[PDB]
């Protein structure tokens, strides 16, 4: 009642004051406290309220401080009944950097989203896949200084976090980055975004082919992905590089 419905009473102006900051600091102690924690983390309304308050530019650092404190100490804060709202919260915080403080906050938040894999290895497919979806989506961000960090962080997530043998590389390619590709029919995204995502999928393919866990149908599938987005600027160079490095990797294992 008081928080969501009475929007006019509690606004941008009120939460920017000292009173709102102390109110939020006292409020998060309930989540810290043992009484209402199991109740509060499950509810939709509370996380909807934090989704609202993350839009407040003054309060973004406070919410990020709370989340960073909470996730590190206890890995059990996240569960299947509350993960997607938290992921949306970090998505909003990372996308807040539209315009240094916001840039630094996004810089920390991207790594934080990348860091939610070691804390709990017991993960569902849809559970893990949203993190990769958010990281892939965050490459769309027009500001160069954030997307250039986002792509390398997503590469650092793919390189040494996910164990293949209870998923597979096929769905990691299909259900993850490829939704960006099929959803990029708008020309405003332009060749820069598709070239960047092509580069990183080439890099991770190179790594896991060096290690070696693939089959014929993999290579056929990324071949189909390449032909689905034909463009004389990028397809020719990437195809030549790929058909050279596949034989280099084949040379790797035999001797």
Q: After which residues is the chain broken (C to N over 2.5 A)?
A: 99, 165
Which method was used?
cryo-EM
CA angle 97, 103, 104 (to 5 degrees): 135
Contacts within 8 Å (CB) and 24+ apart, 53-57: 53/15, 53/24, 54/89, 54/92, 54/93, 54/96, 55/92, 55/96, 56/12, 56/15, 56/16, 57/96, 57/102
């Amino acid at each position: 009642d008081e928080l969501l419905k009475k929007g006019d009473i509690f606004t941008q102006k009120f939460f920017a004051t000292n009173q709102g900051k102390e109110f939020l600091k006292r409020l998060f102690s309930l989540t810290e406290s043992e009484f209402y924690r199991g109740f509060l983390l499950g509810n939709e309304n509370f996380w909807k309220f934090l989704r609202k308050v993350t839009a407040m530019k003054e309060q973004s650092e406070s919410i990020f401080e709370y989340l960073n404190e909470s996730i590190k100490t206890d890995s059990n804060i996240l569960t299947n009944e509350n993960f997607m709202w938290v992921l949306g919260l970090l998505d909003e915080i990372s996308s807040m950097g539209a315009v240094k403080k916001s840039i630094e906050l996004s810089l920390k938040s991207i790594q934080l989203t990348s860091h939610l894999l070691e804390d709990n290895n017991d993960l569902r497919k849809n559970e893990i896949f949203a993190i990769i979806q958010a990281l892939a989506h965050q490459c769309i961000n027009p500001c160069k200084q954030i997307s250039e960090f986002a792509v390398v962080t997503l590469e650092q997530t793919l390189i040494n976090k996910i164990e293949i043998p209870m998923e597979s590389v096929e769905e990691l390619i299909e259900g993850g980055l490829l939704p960006l590709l099929n959803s990029s029919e708008t020309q405003e995204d332009q060749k820069i975004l598709i070239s960047s995502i092509l580069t990183i999928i080439s890099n991770v393919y190179l790594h896991y082919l060096k290690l070696g866990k693939t089959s014929n149908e993999t290579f056929l599938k990324i071949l189909s992905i390449f032909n689905k987005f034909v463009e004389d600027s990028d397809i020719e160079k990437k195809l030549q590089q790929l058909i050279l490095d596949k034989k280099s990797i084949e040379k790797g294992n035999g001797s």
